[PDB]
Write an enzyme that holds these catalytic residues in place. Structure first.
Site, PDB file in Angstrom:
ATOM      1  N   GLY A  29       0.845  -1.166   0.000  1.00 37.56           N
ATOM      2  CA  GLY A  29       0.000   0.000   0.000  1.00 37.56           C
ATOM      3  C   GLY A  29       0.887   1.223   0.000  1.00 37.56           C
ATOM      4  O   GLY A  29       1.973   1.238  -0.591  1.00 37.56           O
ATOM      5  N   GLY A  90      13.725  -7.922   3.179  1.00 37.87           N
ATOM      6  CA  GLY A  90      12.326  -7.922   2.704  1.00 37.87           C
ATOM      7  C   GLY A  90      11.524  -8.962   3.453  1.00 37.87           C
ATOM      8  O   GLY A  90      11.974  -9.455   4.513  1.00 37.87           O
ATOM      9  N   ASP A 132      -2.878 -11.530  12.557  1.00 40.68           N
ATOM     10  CA  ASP A 132      -2.586 -11.914  11.186  1.00 40.68           C
ATOM     11  C   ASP A 132      -1.125 -12.426  11.066  1.00 40.68           C
ATOM     12  O   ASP A 132      -0.380 -11.984  10.216  1.00 40.68           O
ATOM     13  CB  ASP A 132      -2.819 -10.717  10.240  1.00 40.68           C
ATOM     14  CG  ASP A 132      -2.931 -11.122   8.762  1.00 40.68           C
ATOM     15  OD1 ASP A 132      -2.808 -12.343   8.452  1.00 40.68           O
ATOM     16  OD2 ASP A 132      -3.084 -10.170   7.975  1.00 40.68           O
ATOM     17  N   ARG A 136       4.254 -13.765   5.242  1.00 38.75           N
ATOM     18  CA  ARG A 136       4.123 -12.489   4.519  1.00 38.75           C
ATOM     19  C   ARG A 136       4.207 -11.239   5.451  1.00 38.75           C
ATOM     20  O   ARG A 136       4.413 -10.145   4.886  1.00 38.75           O
ATOM     21  CB  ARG A 136       2.776 -12.353   3.688  1.00 38.75           C
ATOM     22  CG  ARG A 136       1.536 -12.561   4.560  1.00 38.75           C
ATOM     23  CD  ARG A 136       0.175 -12.648   3.770  1.00 38.75           C
ATOM     24  NE  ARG A 136      -0.883 -12.879   4.780  1.00 38.75           N
ATOM     25  CZ  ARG A 136      -1.274 -14.080   5.192  1.00 38.75           C
ATOM     26  NH1 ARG A 136      -0.734 -15.196   4.610  1.00 38.75           N
ATOM     27  NH2 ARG A 136      -2.176 -14.228   6.202  1.00 38.75           N
ATOM     28  N   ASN A 137       3.959 -11.445   6.752  1.00 36.16           N
ATOM     29  CA  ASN A 137       4.032 -10.355   7.804  1.00 36.16           C
ATOM     30  C   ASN A 137       5.294 -10.371   8.620  1.00 36.16           C
ATOM     31  O   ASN A 137       5.382  -9.664   9.608  1.00 36.16           O
ATOM     32  CB  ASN A 137       2.808 -10.334   8.696  1.00 36.16           C
ATOM     33  CG  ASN A 137       1.677  -9.500   8.096  1.00 36.16           C
ATOM     34  OD1 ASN A 137       1.896  -8.445   7.523  1.00 36.16           O
ATOM     35  ND2 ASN A 137       0.431  -9.990   8.261  1.00 36.16           N
ATOM     36  N   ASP A 150       3.233  -6.229  11.067  1.00 38.95           N
ATOM     37  CA  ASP A 150       1.809  -6.339  10.632  1.00 38.95           C
ATOM     38  C   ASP A 150       1.517  -5.273   9.583  1.00 38.95           C
ATOM     39  O   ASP A 150       1.329  -4.060   9.878  1.00 38.95           O
ATOM     40  CB  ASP A 150       0.869  -6.195  11.819  1.00 38.95           C
ATOM     41  CG  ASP A 150      -0.608  -6.225  11.381  1.00 38.95           C
ATOM     42  OD1 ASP A 150      -0.892  -6.520  10.150  1.00 38.95           O
ATOM     43  OD2 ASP A 150      -1.447  -5.878  12.220  1.00 38.95           O
TER      44      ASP A 150
END
Ligand SMILES: Cc1ccc(NC(=O)c2ccc(CN3CCN(C)CC3)cc2)cc1Nc1nccc(-c2cccnc2)n1
Ligand SMILES: COC(=O)c1ccc(Cl)cc1N
Ligand SMILES: [Cl-]
Ligand SMILES: [Cl-]
Ligand SMILES: [Cl-]
Ligand SMILES: [Cl-]
Length: 265
Positions: A29, A90, A132, A136-137, A150
Site C-alpha cells: 500500500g 524484505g 494476522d 508475509r508479515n 503487521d
C-alpha cells in the site's frame, strides 16, 4: 520534533526524511522507502484516520529485538507518517522462496522459528493479539535476523477472502475464529503453527489445492497438514500442538519459545 505542552517524543520533522518510491512494487500500500538524511539511514515510511493513529499508538507501546522497530511518527498535520527501520532482505515469505538453501539450512530455519516465537512470547506477555501472523508479515535483515510485523495486508488473490466487510486469510485462521469470530493469543498460536509449516517448506502455500470452503469441515474432522520434508519430528509435534482444536489445549508462546530455545541449543 517537539520542544519538551503536548510533547510526544516520537514526533519528528517530516523534512528530515527524503521520500523515495513505493516499497516492494506497491505490495504494501502507501509504504515508501525513505532516507532519514541526518542519520544517513534508509527507513520504511507508511503514509495516509482512527485506524492509522491507533496503529501508531500501539507501536509506541511495543519494543522487542524481533518486532519491527518504530523510529518515529509525523501525526500533527497530514499527510501522516509512521516511520520504521528498513529490513534489508524484505518479507520472509519471498525470502524463503528465493533463498540459497545451502545458506538457509535446517539450523537457519530453526533460528527463524525461534526468533518469531520470541516476538510472540513478548506480545503474549503484553496482552496484545497479533491477529494476522504469517510469513508475509515477517521481515528479514542481515545474518538471518527475523522480525514480526503487521502490514495490514487483508485489503491490499485468494490469500484473503471476504467475511462480512472483513477479509480473513482462511488457511491461517483458527477454527473458533472462523466459526465464532473469536480471536485471542491462542488463535495467534494456531497461525504460528501455519507459519512454521511455511518456514519448513521454504514458503509453500498451505493446504495446497484445498478449496477454501472445505477447510473448516476438514479441520473439524481432524485433518491437519502433513509433516514437511526434512522437518524434525519435534518441530512437527509443536506444529500439531499449535493446531489443537480447542484453543485452551494449544501451548502458550512462552512454552513454544522455551521448546525452541531448548532445541536451538
Ligand atoms: C512503515 C511501517 C509502519 C507500520 C508498521 N507496523 C507494524 O508492523 C506493526 C507491528 C505490530 C503491531 C502490533 N499489533 C497488535 C494489535 N493487533 C491487532 C495488530 C498488531 C502493529 C503494527 C510497519 C511498517 N514497516 C514496514 N511496512 C511495510 C513494509 C516494510 C518493509 C519492506 C521491505 C523492507 N523493509 C521494510 N516495512
Ligand atoms: C533443525 O531444525 C530444523 O530442521 C527445522 C526447524 C524449524 C522448521 Cl519450521 C523447520 C526445520 N526443518
Ligand atoms: Cl518523554
Ligand atoms: Cl519486501
Ligand atoms: Cl491487541
Ligand atoms: Cl536490516
Amino acid at each position: 520534533a517537539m520542544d519538551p505542552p503536548n510533547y510526544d517524543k516520537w514526533e519528528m520533522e517530516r523534512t528530515d526524511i527524503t521520500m523515495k518510491h513505493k516499497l516492494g512494487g506497491g505490495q504494501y500500500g502507501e509504504v515508501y522507502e525513505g532516507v532519514w538524511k541526518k542519520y544517513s539511514l534508509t527507513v520504511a515510511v507508511k503514509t495516509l484516520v482512527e485506524e492509522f493513529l491507533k496503529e501508531a499508538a500501539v507501536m509506541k507501546e511495543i519494543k522487542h529485538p524481533n518486532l519491527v522497530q518504530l523510529l518515529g511518527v509525523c501525526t500533527r498535520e497530514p499527510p501522516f507518517y509512521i516511520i520504521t527501520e528498513f529490513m534489508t532482505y524484505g518479507n520472509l515469505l519471498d525470502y524463503l522462496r528465493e533463498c540459497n538453501r545451502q545458506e538457509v539450512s535446517a539450523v537457519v530455519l530453526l533460528y527463524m522459528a525461534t526468533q518469531i516465537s520470541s516476538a510472540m512470547e513478548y506480545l503474549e506477555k503484553k496482552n496484545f493479539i497479533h491477529r494476522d501472523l504469517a510469513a508475509r508479515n515477517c521481515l528479514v535483515g542481515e545474518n538471518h535476523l527475523v522480525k514480526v510485523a503487521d502490514f495490514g495486508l487483508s485489503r491490499l488473490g485468494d490469500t484473503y477472502t471476504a467475511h462480512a466487510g472483513a477479509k480473513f486469510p482462511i488457511k491461517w485462521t483458527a477454527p473458533e475464529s472462523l466459526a465464532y469470530n473469536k480471536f485471542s493469543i491462542k488463535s495467534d498460536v494456531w497461525a504460528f503453527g501455519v507459519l512454521l509449516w511455511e518456514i519448513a517448506t521454504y514458503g509453500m502455500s498451505p493446504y495446497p489445492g484445498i478449496d477454501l470452503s472445505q477447510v473448516y469441515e476438514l479441520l473439524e474432522k481432524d485433518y491437519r497438514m502433513e509433516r514437511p520434508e526434512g522437518c524434525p519430528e519435534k518441530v512437527y509435534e509443536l506444529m500439531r500442538a499449535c493446531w489443537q482444536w480447542n484453543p485452551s489445549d494449544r501451548p502458550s508462546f512462552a512454552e513454544i519459545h522455551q521448546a525452541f530455545e531448548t532445541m536451538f541449543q
